Design a protein around this ligand. Structure first.
Ligand SMILES: c1nc(N2CCC3(CCCCN3)CC2)c2nc[nH]c2n1
Lengths: 342, 18
C-alpha cells in the first residue's frame, strides 16, 4: 500500500505513548546503594558515566552522574531537566533506554542500558573511514530516529560519532540528550558541537529541526571521508568555513552521495532536505538510499557491516581508560529547589 | 592531502559541546 500511511499510523501511536510519560514523568526509581560502581566509560562537564552492576539482578548498566552544583555554575539547569524528562518519555530502537533515575544531596543519576561496542567515533578514527554502504547503514538509522524525534516536536542538537554507540548487533544507540528540547516554535540557544553547527545557529538566528538535518549531512560526510567537511584547529575558523557556502568532497565520493550532501549541507532553508513540503521523504527517496529497506532497518533485519568484539559481560575493551574519582555525597542537600522535578 | 591535514590538526580527539 502506502508506506507513508503506515508511518503516519506508527507515529500517531508513538506520540500517544510519549505524551503520557512526558506529562507524568517517572521519578526516584532506584537508589545509588543498589549499584556497584565498576569503571568510568566517559566523562562530561558535570561528571562521569560509569559502568555499574545492579546487585539485585546482576545486570550491567551505564550510570550518568551529574554534580548539581556544576550544572548550576554552567547554567545547565533547564537543559538537564529537558534531558531526563525527554529520555524517560521516548522509545525507539536506536535510542538508548533510561532504566532508572534518582538524586541525592550532591548528584543527579541516570541509569541507562549499557551498550558495550563503544562509540562509533572510536571505530571511525581507528579504521579511518567507512565505505559508502557501511555509512548508509548508520545514516538510515539516524534518518529514522530523527523522523521519530521530530514528530514529537523534539530537536536533538548534538549529532556526532561520539554520541552514537554500537550495540552487540552492530546497530546504533544514540546517547547524550543534554541539548534535546521539546519546542514547537523556533529556538535560539547557542549549543551543539562546532563541526556540526548549522549556519543559522552560528548566525544567532531563531532555528528549528532543520539544524538536525544539517548535522546529518556533517555526520554522513565524516563517516564516508574520515574527516569532517569543515575542520580547523579552533572553533572560530570552523564557523568561518561553515558560513562561507563552500564544501569540497573527496574524489572517491559517489555522484549520489555528493548530491545528497549538497541538499543536506544546504545554507538555504527553503532548499534544505528534511525542511521542505515532502519532509523526511526527500531524504528516504533520495538515490543514495535506493538500496535501503527502511522497514528492514527499523526491524533490525539487515545484517550489520561491523560487529564489535565482546569479551563477555562487563567488558569495557571498546572504551578508552579514564582517571577514577571516588563519588562523594554531601551531608547537606544542594540545589534542592532547582532540581525538584528530577 | 586533506586526510593528512586533519590528522595533524588539534581536533581528531573526542569533541566537547560548546
Ligand atoms: C555505554 N557507554 C555509555 N557512555 C556514555 C556516553 C559516552 C561518554 C560521554 C561522551 C559520549 N559518549 C560513552 C560512554 C552509555 N550511556 C548510556 N549507555 C551507555 N553505554
Amino acid at each position: 500500500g502506502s508506506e507513508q500511511e503506515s508511518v503516519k499510523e506508527f507515529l500517531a501511536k508513538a506520540k500517544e505513548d510519549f505524551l503520557k510519560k512526558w506529562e507524568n514523568p517517572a521519578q526516584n526509581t532506584a537508589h545509588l546503594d543498589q549499584f556497584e560502581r565498576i569503571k568510568t566509560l566517559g566523562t562530561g562537564s558535570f561528571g562521569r558515566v560509569m559502568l555499574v552492576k545492579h546487585m539485585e539482578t546482576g545486570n550491567h548498566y551505564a550510570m550518568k552522574i551529574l554534580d548539581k552544583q556544576k550544572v548550576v555554575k554552567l547554567k545547565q539547569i533547564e537543559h538537564t531537566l529537558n534531558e531526563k524528562r525527554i529520555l524517560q518519555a521516548v522509545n525507539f530502537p536506536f535510542l538508548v533506554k533510561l532504566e532508572f533515575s534518582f538524586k541525592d544531596n550532591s548528584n543527579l543519576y541516570m541509569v541507562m542500558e549499557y551498550v558495550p561496542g563503544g562509540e562509533m567515533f572510536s571505530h571511525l578514527r581507528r579504521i579511518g573511514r567507512f565505505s559508502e554502504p557501511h555509512a548508509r547503514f548508520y545514516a538510515a538509522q539516524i534518518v529514522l530516529t530523527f523522523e521519530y524525534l521530530h514528530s514529537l516536536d523534539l530537536i536533538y542538537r548534538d549529532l556526532k560519532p561520539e554520541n552514537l554507540l554500537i550495540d552487540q548487533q552492530g546497530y546504533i544507540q544514540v546517547t547524550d540528550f543534554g541539548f534535546a528540547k521539546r519546542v514547537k516554535g523556533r529556538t535560539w540557544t547557542l549549543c551543539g558541537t562546532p563541526e556540526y553547527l548549522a549556519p543559522e545557529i552560528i548566525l544567532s538566528k531563531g532555528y528549528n529541526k532543520a539544524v538536525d538535518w544539517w548535522a546529518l549531512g556533517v555526520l554522513i560526510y565524516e563517516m564516508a571521508a574520515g574527516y569532517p567537511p569543515f575542520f580547523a584547529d579552533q572553533p572560530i575558523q570552523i564557523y568561518e568555513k561553515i558560513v562561507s557556502g563552500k564544501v569540497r568532497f573527496p574524489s572517491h565520493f559517489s555522484s549520489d552521495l555528493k548530491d545528497l550532501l549538497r541538499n543536506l549541507l544546504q545554507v538555504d532553508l527553503t532548499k534544505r532536505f528534511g525542511n521542505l513540503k515532502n519532509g523526511v521523504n526527500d531524504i528516504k527517496n533520495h538515490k543514495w538510499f535506493a538500496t535501503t529497506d527502511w522497514i528492514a532497518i527499523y526491524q533490525r533485519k539487515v545484517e550489520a557491516p561491523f560487529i564489535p568484539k565482546f569479551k563477555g559481560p562487563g567488558d569495557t575493551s571498546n572504551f578508552d581508560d579514564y582517571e577514577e574519582e571516588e563519588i562523594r555525597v554531601s551531608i547537606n542537600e544542594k540545589c534542592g529547589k532547582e532540581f525538584s522535578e528530577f | 592531502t586533506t586526510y593528512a591535514d586533519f590528522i595533524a590538526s588539534g581536533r581528531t580527539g573526542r569533541r566537547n559541546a560548546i
